[PDB]
Design goal:
about 120 residues; alpha+beta; SHC Adaptor Protein; two-stranded antiparallel sheet; Ras GTPase-activating protein 1
Length: about 120
Amino acid sequence: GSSGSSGREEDPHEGKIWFHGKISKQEAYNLLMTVGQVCSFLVRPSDNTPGDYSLYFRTNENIQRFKICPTPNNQFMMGGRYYNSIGDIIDHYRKEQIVEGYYLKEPVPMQDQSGPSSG
């Protein structure tokens, strides 16, 4: 007895509002400038490198880009740091400026193409 379904399912990580996967690297840029704004960041799965991650922060000056390499201790590394998990890294930065003088206010909202609004 199958006692369950299979085929079309959704992941929890892909449900985060700060997470971004549907978009691309180039889009993310123009996104943080349109859909986002100063004091706004977003996480995206490293394309060129299937297994890593990269943070994209937006500052009045310009858009930056951090590197988050995976660790053999089920954790993530950011700027020579070590946190339990991504979600945490953020909650932490919310207390300790991530830049020389910037703090994480709110991440970038995800776009839901699905909708009646058509040409």
